[PDB]
């Protein structure tokens, strides 16, 4: 039995709300197709308990789910069963990753990112086009896989969150992480960041530290082909300031019934194995992140995309 | 899959709310014992859907459950499993009885009565003593068995309901029914009521029509001892104007074997005496207990108890 308990009341409201949201959708027929109204829909719940369940849950909170029918259909197109999703988000509390905060589900399958109200407005502005793009690629994309979007209110605090699939593996640990833009201005981790023992390194760190990505020509072509189409989609929406998140798993260093270095490509959908000539056995996890910044909110989206694709193409 | 659809949006909210209430309590530990705060507690939820689930549910509604921990414990003490209760109130809509509105669950196990805010206030006034009484009698009582109490809202309408166990059988038909007070004044079904095909007859119809109830001595002793303890409980609470609801099933005018019933489901049933001129089953319980104090509560109770022993 689950109680949704947490020291962080926002996590309790999130778990309660995802549990509630998924159960509610079990009482709503699955439509033949989404319609325009589903992209402006929401469900809001306001809870006020008095002297009830008062050690597991906050007594007064609100939970709002945006476009529930759309995100349910996106989960299906991404191969995610609603009961599994519900269990991953509620069986045990999500864990913080240390404004641009994220949590990971306890089973490391999903990311919960705190976003702004402007980000929520931009997601609504692109949701029809994004959903149609996901339909056309059959869910195979390097874009983030958006699975749910909520507003939480508890204790005088109001936050928005979006749930995505983890770019990294739910099982294989990542020992080096980069956030790449192709901009060449202030793209280097701080000495504070580099003191954590999993820093997020940036463009000039990837160059200066001699980072290589050893993937064979077949996989590189497939990857860069996918990247081009995904970025061209973002540029058409006038989006910019997105990154390539690159995570590297070291097979021989995690050592000290899947065999070493193996991963389920239907769960870890962004993994690519290294080529046979790599100096260490590695697995790479690469995807586009932070896509919600609109142009008119210097380089324009067209120039940004060409600089991004050029840089990623040069580093392989 | 259940959708809670109804032509009556208040029934959709009731079904939705009972579904919600029971599922929520599955995420709340069962306590070792109830505490005072549980008798003042409530859970409230307000739902505002926009362009979502608009074919099954009202877009705007609210659902409030009074003292959820208490009614959960009462359901357990009355032998009612929460999932069964949830299923009985939601798998198909409750049906109206066709003022003092009643609906019956689709499987005829439970009754949903509309009550006033004054009734809700009286229920809170007595709930502690009621629960303690149900503990002391191990759930064996002729009083209504209260299973849940809610407030329902749909955008311009607010109602209160209480859920009880059906006094009548969930399978066996009732061919005659009475509501008895021990009149001392005149209680008589109207000619309008008396044109329906199941009227609620009253004291003078029972007397005037020669109704006799034939139960054996042991069953009568058990019933009247229970009735005395229950009525003295009501009198102590200063309650009055309650009735004995009497339903009579006719065994070979209506047709588990005939005349045969489960006393663990139809907990108010009593078999007639084997020598009765015809085979009947009786369903008898005290109802309408929420009126707080010429007649005073002690006089009402003695007049009531004298009348019922009086007709057996
Ligand atoms: C809503 S959005 O599309 O606009 N933005 C977005 C940003 C990050 C992720 C994401 C996805 N997968 C894993 C992580 C974990 C990280 S990221 C980092 N620097 N260190 C970590 O551990 C983060 C997904 C979407
Ligand atoms: C909330 S309360 O305790 O104060 N009042 C109360 C009143 C009636 C019932 C009840 C219980 N079981 C069956 C019936 C059906 C009836 S009653 C009638 N006259 N004709 C019918 O079909 C009604 C339970 C409680």
Q: How far is CA B3 from CA B16, B90, B91, B175, in A?
A: 9, 9, 9, 34
Same domain, B113 and B216: no
Q: Do B45 and A41 touch (CB under 8 A)?
A: no
Q: Counting ligands in written order, which one lies closest to the CA of residue B291? A: 2
Same domain, B150 and B234: no
Q: Do A1 and B27 touch (CB under 8 A)?
A: yes
Same domain, B118 and B190: no
CA–CA separation, B168 vs B110, rounded Å?
10
- Element at B309 (helix H, strand E): helix B297-311
Instruction: Choose among B311, B246, B251: nearest CA to B278.
Output: B251
Bridge partners (DSSP) of residue A285 are A247, A271
Same domain, A72 and A53: yes
CB atoms within 10 A of CB B123: 19
CB B56 within 8 A of CB A28: yes
CB atoms within 10 A of CB A264: 12
Give the residues after which the backbone of chain A is interrupted, taking a C-to-next-N distance over 2.5 angstroms as a break: 98, 256, 297
Same domain, B103 and B234: no
How close A80 gets to chain B, by Cα (Å)?
A: 20
Residues ≥6 apart with Cβ < 8 Å to A263: A169, A171, A172, A271, A283
Instruction: Choose among B91, B95, B86, B88: nearest CA to B109.
Output: B88
Contacts 24+ apart (CB under 8 A), A299-306: A299/A240, A300/A240, A301/A234, A301/A235, A301/A237, A301/A238, A301/A239, A301/A240, A302/A235, A304/A182, A304/A235, A304/A240, A304/A241, A305/A231, A305/A232, A305/A234, A305/A235, A305/A240
Same domain, A180 and A49: no
CB A245 within 8 A of CB A167: yes
CB B166 within 8 A of CB B111: yes
Method: X-ray
CA–CA separation, B36 vs B251, rounded Å?
47
Backbone angles phi and psi of B242, in degrees to 5 = -85, 165
Q: How far is CA A188 from CA A96, A181, A242, A243, in A?
A: 24, 11, 16, 14
| Resolution of the PDB structure in angstroms | 1.7
Where b means 16+ CB within 10 Å and e means fewer, A203-241 reads bebbeeeeeebbbeeeeeeebeebbeebbebbbebbbbb
Half-sphere exposure (Cβ direction) of B106: Cα atoms closer than 13 Å: 13
CA–CA separation, B111 vs A83, rounded Å?
34
CA–CA separation, B49 vs B22, rounded Å?
22
Q: Least CA distance to B40: which residue of chain A?
A: A51
CA–CA separation, A32 vs A29, rounded Å?
9
How close A23 gets to chain B, by Cα (Å)?
A: 10
**Domain final residue pick, B150, B166, B182:** B166
Q: How far is the CA of A23 from the centre of ligand 1 (A)?
A: 27
Torsion, CA A14, CA A155, CA A120, CA A267, rounded to 10:
-20
CA–CA separation, B69 vs B218, rounded Å?
37
**Domain final residue pick, B166, B201, B234:** B166
Backbone angles phi and psi of A45, in degrees to 5 = -130, 135
**Domain final residue pick, B136, B166, B196:** B166
Q: Any CB–CB contact under 8 A between B68 and chain A?
A: yes
Same domain, A96 and A23: yes
Instruction: Choose among B219, B212, B218, B215: nearest CA to B273.
Output: B215
| Contact list, B68 vs chain A (CB under 8 Å) | 52
CA–CA separation, A155 vs A60, rounded Å?
8
CA–CA separation, B196 vs B179, rounded Å?
16
Report the first-to-last Cα separation within chain A, whole angstroms. 48
Same domain, B136 and B217: no
Q: Supply A259's token pair.
A: 């065999």
Same domain, B155 and B16: yes
Same domain, B304 and B202: yes
User: Do β-strands A239-240 and A157-165 pair in parallel, antiparallel, or remain unpaired?
Assistant: unpaired
Same domain, A233 and A124: no
Same domain, A72 and A215: no
Instruction: Choose among A163, A145, A154: nearest CA to A104.
Output: A163
Counting the structural domains of chain A, the total is 2
CB B276 within 8 A of CB B214: yes
% helix / strand / coil in chain B, to the nearest 5? 35, 25, 40
CA angle A92, A93, A95 (to 5 degrees): 125
CA–CA separation, B249 vs B42, rounded Å?
39
Q: Do B27 and A52 touch (CB under 8 A)?
A: no
Q: How far is the CA of B114 from the centre of ligand 2 (A)?
A: 10
Q: Least CA distance to A3: which residue of chain B?
A: B27
Residue owning tokens 């009579």: B248
CA angle B305, B309, B312 (to 5 degrees): 145
Torsion, CA B270, CA B276, CA B277, CA B281, rounded to 10:
10
Torsion, CA A229, CA A233, CA A239, CA A244, rounded to 10:
-30
What is the domain extent for residue A284? 167-314
Active-site annotation of A, residues:
113, 241
CA–CA separation, A123 vs A146, rounded Å?
10
């Amino acid at each position: 039995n689950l109680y949704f308990q947490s020291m962080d009341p926002l996590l309790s409201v999130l778990m309660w709300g995802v549990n509630h949201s998924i159960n509610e959708l079990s009482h709503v027929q699955i439509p033949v197709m989404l319609m325009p109204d589903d992209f402006k829909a929401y469900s809001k719940i306001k809870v006020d308990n008095h002297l009830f369940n008062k050690e597991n849950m906050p007594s007064h909170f609100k939970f709002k789910e945006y476009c529930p029918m759309v995100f349910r259909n996106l989960r299906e197109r991404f191969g995610i069963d609603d009961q599994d999703f519900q269990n991953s988000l509620t069986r045990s509390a999500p864990l913080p990753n240390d404004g641009a905060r994220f949590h990971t589900s306890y089973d490391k399958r999903y990311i919960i990112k705190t976003i702004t109200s402007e980000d929520v407005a931009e997601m609504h502005n692109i949701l029809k086009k994004y959903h149609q793009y996901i339909v056309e690629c059959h869910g195979i994309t390097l874009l983030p896989q958006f699975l749910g979007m909520y507003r939480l209110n508890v204790d005088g605090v109001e936050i928005y969150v979006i749930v995505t699939r983890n770019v990294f593996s739910h099982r294989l640990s990542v020992y080096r992480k980069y956030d790449l833009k192709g901009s060449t201005v202030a793209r280097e981790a701080s000495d504070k960041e580099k003191a954590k023992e999993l820093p997020t390194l940036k463009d000039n760190d990837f160059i200066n530290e001699g980072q290589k990505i050893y993937i064979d020509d077949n996989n590189k072509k497939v990857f860069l082909e996918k990247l081009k189409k995904d970025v061209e989609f973002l540029a058409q929406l006038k989006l910019m300031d997105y990154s390539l998140l690159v995570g590297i798993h070291d097979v021989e260093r995690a050592e000290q019934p899947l065999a070493p270095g193996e991963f389920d490509p239907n769960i870890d959908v962004y993994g690519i194995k290294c080529h046979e000539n790599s100096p260490r056995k590695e697995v790479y996890f690469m995807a586009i992140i932070d896509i919600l910044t609109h142009y008119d909110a210097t380089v324009n989206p067209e120039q940004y995309s060409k600089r991004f694709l050029d840089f990623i193409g040069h580093i392989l």
